[PDB]
Design an enzyme around this catalytic site. Structure first.
Site, short mmCIF file in Angstrom:
data_model
loop_
_atom_site.label_atom_id
_atom_site.label_comp_id
_atom_site.label_asym_id
_atom_site.label_seq_id
_atom_site.Cartn_x
_atom_site.Cartn_y
_atom_site.Cartn_z
CG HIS A 44 30.74 -14.20 18.05
ND1 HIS A 44 30.53 -14.59 16.59
CD2 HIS A 44 31.90 -13.68 18.32
CE1 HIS A 44 32.11 -14.68 16.28
NE2 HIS A 44 32.79 -14.07 17.19
CB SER A 65 33.77 -13.03 14.05
OG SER A 65 34.52 -14.07 14.72
N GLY A 66 32.31 -12.63 11.34
CA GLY A 66 31.30 -11.80 10.71
C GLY A 66 31.64 -11.68 9.22
N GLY A 119 38.91 -12.55 15.15
CA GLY A 119 38.84 -11.22 14.26
C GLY A 119 38.44 -11.29 12.84
CG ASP A 173 27.57 -15.66 15.58
OD1 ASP A 173 28.78 -16.17 15.56
OD2 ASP A 173 27.33 -14.48 15.85
#
Ligand SMILES: [Cl-]
Lengths: 13, 230, 230, 13
Positions: C42, C180-181, C178, C87
């Site tokens: 995402h 994320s990942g 922020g 994801d």
């Protein structure tokens, strides 16, 4: 564009 | 859409459903001509997804729908996944849609158009009808809702509101999960015109908080420039 | 991360920042070897984005950092933007990172690794420290937090929790926009190993609600197959 | 992999 052949009917105007 | 109502079948002829290759709906879109669909960049559309035009009831066996393949994905290069600004993607279809009484285009605004805060506009889609729901509704929903000024919108969202965004709602209805990419249309001179693209909002889809939409006037020149070059 | 604490500088050497070309941070990632970074699908990363490794304080311009270009983006074909399942994305760098004290790799788990519920793991990143904040924090944040079982996580999130997800938190801290990942890491046989990829949660980043991560054991075979063919 | 040359220090662990 933007004038449907089948008229939308909405409750809110 | 939370607290919306079923639409009349075929009355929003530009509304498309973006589905994976198994028929699972994840985002909406709008036809702007026979070869091109506009949607939200955060939907993450690829060339394996499919565009479904002319659908009303996704649980219906029989409906005359057109399943179109995507030839090319054009994500706006200023999209930013943290701020969620410039949330717009264009899809070029590999096969042209066939317009009919239930499939046709929405109008695009001009970059100088102005839609006043307070105007009653409409948004449609197959997004969740309740954030706790497991599945998206089988039948297209609609809600009418007011536009807001960016200044009033900022009362609720602060500096998250950028110039390429426009807010609407906070009046008993809300766009929700799965509505993204779909249209926010307002009437201009007898024709429904695309003023917003369903973009983001609260993860509870609260009906007392405004949904946020990509502001099509701020992005129409990029749309035109991409259509001309491709 | 909400309610986290600053990390010791350079102590999470696989943590990378994904930025646009003006230095705007929008997601985290983790180095899994010199040429590859794992992040969330995402985030919407493209080959115009840059990977920055070795950074601690993003407001400082005196740190020795490595700004690496992305040669190719491999998004998992089962990612779905509505359910937010699967994801994960892999980035192959066009220039290899140089491992050093502050830059090195996190271990991947094997698909049969088990991480018990209640284990205390760590998540890091430069995500918001308050959902109403305007800017992401300059210095790298870290939080400790317990893993939940999918059954207990369903108490808060219902059927949105899928097999390729794992929850952590609801313990006074939370991943936020922020983050994320970036990594959810747990110790396995003496080494920090990647168990989760920050993925989604409540839009108020509520610290009494668990964060949801992509479950790396359910996805490592796709990772290893992509690395082996590329 | 997974060790760090600079040891992390955490309150919560
Ligand atoms: Cl993307």
């Amino acid at each position: 564009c933007g004038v449907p052949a089948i008229q939308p009917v909405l409750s809110g105007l | 859409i939370v607290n919306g109502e079923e639409a009349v079948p075929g009355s929003w002829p530009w509304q498309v459903s973006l589905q994976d290759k198994t028929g699972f709906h994840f985002c909406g879109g709008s036809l702007i001509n026979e070869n091109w669909v506009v949607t939200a960049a955060h939907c993450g559309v690829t060339t394996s997804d499919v565009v479904v035009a002319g659908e009303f009831d996704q649980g219906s066996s029989s409906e005359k729908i057109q399943k179109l393949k995507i030839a090319k994905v054009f994500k706006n290069s200023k999209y930013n996944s943290l701020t969620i600004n410039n949330d717009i993607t264009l899809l070029k279809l590999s096969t042209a849609a066939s317009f009919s009484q239930t499939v046709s285009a929405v109008c695009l605004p001009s970059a100088s158009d102005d839609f006043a805060a307070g105007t009653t506009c409409v948004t449609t889609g197959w997004g969740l009808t309740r954030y706790t729901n497991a599945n998206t509704p089988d039948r297209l929903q609609q809600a009418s809702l007011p536009l807001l000024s960016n200044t009033n919108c900022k009362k609720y969202w602060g500096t998250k509101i950028k110039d390429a965004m426009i807010c609407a709602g906070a009046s008993g209805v809300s766009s929700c999960m799965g509505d993204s990419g779909g249209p926010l249309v307002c009437k201009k001179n007898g024709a429904w015109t695309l003023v917003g693209i369903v973009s983001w909002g609260s993860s509870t889809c609260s009906t007392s908080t405004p949904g946020v939409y990509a502001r099509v006037t701020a992005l129409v020149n990029w749309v035109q420039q991409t259509l001309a070059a491709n």
